[PDB]
Design a protein around this ligand. Sequence first.
Ligand SMILES: O=C(O)c1cc([N+](=O)[O-])ccc1O
Ligand SMILES: [Mn+2]
Lengths: 212, 209
Amino acid sequence: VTVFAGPSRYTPYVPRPVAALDSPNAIVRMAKLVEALEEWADNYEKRYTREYGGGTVVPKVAIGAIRGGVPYKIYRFPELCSIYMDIRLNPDTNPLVVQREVEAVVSKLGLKAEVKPFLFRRGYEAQGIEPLQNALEVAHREVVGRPTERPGSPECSMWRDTNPYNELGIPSLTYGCGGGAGGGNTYFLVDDMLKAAKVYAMTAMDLCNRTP
Amino acid sequence: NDVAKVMKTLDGMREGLIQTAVELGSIEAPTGREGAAGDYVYEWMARNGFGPERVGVFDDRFNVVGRLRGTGGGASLSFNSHLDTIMAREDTARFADANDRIYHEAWHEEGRIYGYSVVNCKGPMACWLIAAKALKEAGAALKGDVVLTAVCGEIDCEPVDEFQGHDYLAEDIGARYAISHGAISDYALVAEATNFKPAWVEAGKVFLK
Ligand SMILES: O=C(O)c1cc([N+](=O)[O-])ccc1O
Ligand SMILES: [Mn+2]
């Protein structure tokens, strides 16, 4: 998201006082856009929460980077300033819909901006997962002792490589020990790692002996 | 009067003034790459017999100092303008239109000369380069020296964080370096744009991260 302003002025000529949204300094305007975008994000994750058999997807939003202009030439404030947003999608959300929502936040503030997508990947729920699901379930109850529980939302609402497999028709799930690093967990119990390796092996012995 | 002779000399140099300003403003010279512009001014001063020297910290970013020597017994006057310009074609992060025209070129239209490179500062520099030429070539009587000081790095670029050294230095290697290394005189007129209004106070600055 690049917000435009201007005209550029050498610091001894900058007009003051001026309303934030009218500032010639694009950094100043962006700061106002950021709090509007944070509230939009607060409501986004709730509006687009969606439950699937494979888990509940809670799609979140973060502002991951900002810049404008360059640190080694600061005697003129920037005519532009960019923000970089990570916006997670549930499998059923079109990226263009999200872009218009953001274009609208900007429009409500009366700002001139460019909202440009530079990454798009689709999320998927597995189709025909039952054989792997079952093979794993059997192994899990043997090694861990109880039925499996429904996954925590953050671990359903990220990017993991189940997506490429699913996209290409290889039914796929994710499973391992410990809390996610995004959490952030910083360790594994050696005993749990051993448990997992056992589950992985058992899963293989079931599944790899079926005829396709 | 020996003054009027110079004025009529200057009336005849309108064309060299224009040409010098345009040729000079046309040179790519944002802060950090003022070498080529320095070279032009050096060679200009040499042709006109001002005996120039390159005074600098780097061989491609330097100040140019030459003189119009006096008969003896007078006060020295410096004329000062800077060789660097504001916009680099690089700067897409500060300007909406980094590659306009007014940002990088310089041309004579109507009775004007256009280009940021001319207003700041190639510009007032052309004005006194010509003025110096008129005085010399009109054989004006001067007891004191006229010092011609063309500097690099006037504009407020400064190094910070990981941006260090040659590419980001400015004022530390500009005028104060020239003065500390010979370019001294009794008085100094800095030729930049006011509206024919003299100023002799200026501000300091502190940069905060
Ligand atoms: O699987 C994860 O927890 C995970 C976390 C991050 N991260 O916290 O940036 C990135 C990729 C991951 O797979
Ligand atoms: Mn200047």
